[PDB]
Symmetry: D2
Subunit: 298 residues, 4 copies
């Protein structure tokens, strides 16, 4: 039903998760960028990225909360929905440890699918803990994460992408990490999110062992190095994620404007650092609104 | 115990003038607080644009309310909220005021633009009659608490000139508006006349990229202005900065060149007041 | 794989007629499903009244959308949703259709009443011009998927009589409405003429306590009607029953007299399909 | 600022939690009824009840979900908000085990207060558990519940009422129950929700030991008997809760109407069982809307 030139060729109607699978296959590698809101998703789309990301940490911090697992399915879901309403670019969503036991995880998968989300990642961290527990990083046993994956796979559609994230590497080293990852794939993970993988020549071994597409997480200000997308792909990596990059720059920029207005009683010095009205109207595709009204009405 | 509305009333009286900055989310509200502003603002245009929509009145009470709630959950800094034309007739307006108060909001502004119109109407800026805006104000005043601040915004100046603008403003005050949002006054020497006539605290809107010039806080205050609003200033800079990071990552396959332009982890932990979390847990537990 | 809208289209074609019952929440939608209805309905008046508000158009897209989402999360039974007059101009209507589709809703109906009006306007029922409703329909059709069902509702009959009603209906179909909601046809012998002229499936609204009489499904179908709606039937009975329990507890200091009128734990566990939860856990784990 | 007749007397401005405290003090005992939505809250108010209740089980079941702790703070909070928008009658809200650790509990208290809720109850059940855990009832240790209470008390306002609920009685017997309850009061619970207390002559001992107002939960179809409000008060009980009574009757009534419409092709036989339009307009206080428009406009 879709055309190429004047030639009517087969095109399959593509669901969010299939668009994502397709973006992985067609890119080398797929760069996925963090976006904290619909407008950022549009900036990313306009720059020409083929997939976007909703960070768990970002959702919390944007609420003015620490990334301590205070947020729930609704906090993430509402931000996801806002983004998928604005763009069909496949969206990857951080759902932490699933927000509870088997049926919470099921509800999260279904709600994410109803929100037109393309993929989620779920982590093998310890969840909930005691009331007064101090912040930190603990892994669950492989079997506890297997159960989480099964709860998810049990209700997902075929197209929808479950990415199991492991933080084993920093704590248990490369061998034990590869072991979990393989167990996670066997339990039904579609892909793997390798967190904090240091030396790039460990990638080919990691990727070859796990078989499914692997995502490398390019964070800042942590204890992991920054390689290029090309380098990571040459070492067998299929996705590269930039989770918080843009929002760290948005923050510094907003702080700078606030300080200018405070210090100078006016924002004149900030004008050069601001997006122009015209770029804004363009990213919002404002003209298509006027054009739609002319197409249909008066 | 001071109510949100009272904190705001107090910030107007005690600052010369009160600078109110736009913040699009809780995190921005915290940055603003940390820089030391005494009042913050939730722009209606910002709510739409943040959702990836044009400022064409597509958004409803729930869209603004949800963003307001997220900001008041993070900070007690008095918040001023743009509720457009009120989102409907008298009972919608009533619902909006009550919901805003229940959200711990300190003030709202409502405008004298024409609302809804016909289905296929073209975008623009048209004023309602003075009597239609009076009705709007009465609906709002009827349910507001004493402390809560209703600010009537008029866009009359560009369309009807300074005389007719002062007339509306005064009618709006008489209908029960607490303060006045004077939109798009070009010459600063319009202000002293406007402010003197209107009597109640007046807010001047310092926007960028419009058809209005930029004066300083001091200049505006010396000309009788009590509040100065910076509605989108921070978010225009956030957008350029996000765009720059996106372009860098795309062009260079990595974000290295962007690192100098990013807030450090430590500044982030600080704005989030992260240590108070660890300290609270040590105070109460193990 | 059948889309919500297609399931609904299919239920219209294959039933004679399709009975669509009101449900105010997911639990009611499940009771309805269990009794074996093939399509369910979310009333706009029900959404308002459930919130403790009169049906005066105080509610917005978010109010109806949230209730819709809760019901579609629990059941795949095709859901018909009252979106009133569309909640604003062309882009609000567009947003409403898209949001309803993203909510897995199968159909909506939109009415040709006048919307918003002046701030202090008195409640009532006034029609928009045919051209204003055409514009509404075009805004909706422009963004809908093929399968999704737009039902134009007209209240013309009581105000303008059968002739002018058939005229609008036909104009609405030509503008792209998939089906027709004929509101307040008194005499059943109005139906065959109406239905024959309009051609597309027609819905008759079987309300209580109004100014319209009650015919049976069979009667309505024999007179050319394809859907019959029971918009508030269940919720009027729920209200009487809740009131009765409240009065009992108040008057007797205990709810003993109410016990015979309550659904048993076991019927509840059954409607919730509770066993499938235990069975799922045994299937997958320990 | 408030008047009695023509005599201007002192009246304190009363916060939701104070209204609740006051309703306890002034009634003997206070009957609190379950209401699943704003309209039900209004029916209750109209019948003249002085406090209303939002059941956790009710929130889930109304969503078409089992009471298995699938729901989160947002599910309860949204239903609470809908009710407090319609009525100032003090509302008691079930927040289960608090939906997470210390800061989730803090967020729940603050969000409940911002919603104009008067009181909440929190339970000493085990939370979250493993992914594939089977449904059931386990108590946490007294110390784990103490921690939960402290998280709550730490952020609550003075007026706001924390009610600690214990399910110890059915599992651990009267002695151990009184022990927890006393520990919970000392940790800062304002009142106590005694679940499943069988023999009424155990109440005076229970109430005398715990000191703070005690709530007896009048459920149906469980393993607990039904006494009258008067009987329970004479035995030292200060609140009596009717958590699901009205919604069990609403369900049977809606099922009956659906079956009638199915079986008869019309709802004629159901008409006698339906609230009249006029009672509806009245409970909605529809006339006050017309009167308000006449007061202010044309
Ligand atoms: Cl714009
Ligand atoms: Cl610097
Ligand atoms: Cl009504
Ligand atoms: Cl029976």
């Amino acid at each position: 039903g879709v055309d190429l030139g004047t030639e009517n060729l087969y095109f399959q109607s593509m669901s969010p998760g299939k668009l994502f699978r397709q973006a992985v296959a067609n890119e080398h590698p797929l760069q996925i960028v963090g976006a904290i809101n619909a407008y950022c998703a549009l900036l990313a789309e306009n720059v020409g990225f083929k997939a976007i990301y909703l960070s768990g940490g970002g959702v919390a911090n944007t609420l003015g909360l620490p990334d301590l697992g205070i947020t729930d399915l609704h906090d993430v879901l509402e931000d996801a929905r806002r983004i998928t309403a604005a763009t069909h670019l496949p969206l990857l969503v951080d759902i932490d440890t699933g927000f509870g036991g088997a049926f919470t995880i099921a509800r999260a998968i279904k709600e994410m699918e109803r929100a037109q989300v393309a993929a989620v990642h779920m982590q093998d961290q310890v969840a909930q803990k005691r009331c007064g527990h101090r912040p930190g990083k603990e892994l669950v046993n492989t079997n506890e994460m297997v159960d989480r994956i099964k709860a998810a796979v049990d209700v997902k559609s075929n197209d929808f992408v479950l990415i199991a994230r492991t933080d084993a590497y920093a704590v248990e080293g490369l061998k034990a990490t590869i072991d979990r990852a393989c167990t996670y794939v066997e339990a039904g993970a579609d892909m793997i999110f390798a967190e904090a993988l240091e030396n790039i020549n460990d990638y080919p071994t990691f990727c070859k062992a796990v078989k499914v597409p692997v995502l490398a997480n390019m964070t800042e200000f942590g204890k992991t190095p920054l390689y290029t997308a090309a380098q990571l792909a040459d070492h067998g990596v299929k996705m590269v994620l930039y989770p918080r990059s843009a929002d760290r720059a948005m923050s510094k920029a907003a702080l700078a404007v606030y300080e200018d207005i405070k210090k100078h009683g006016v924002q004149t010095a900030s004008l050069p650092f601001m997006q122009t009205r015209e770029a804004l109207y363009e990213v919002l595709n404002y003209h298509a609104y006027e054009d739609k009204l002319n197409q249909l009405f008066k």
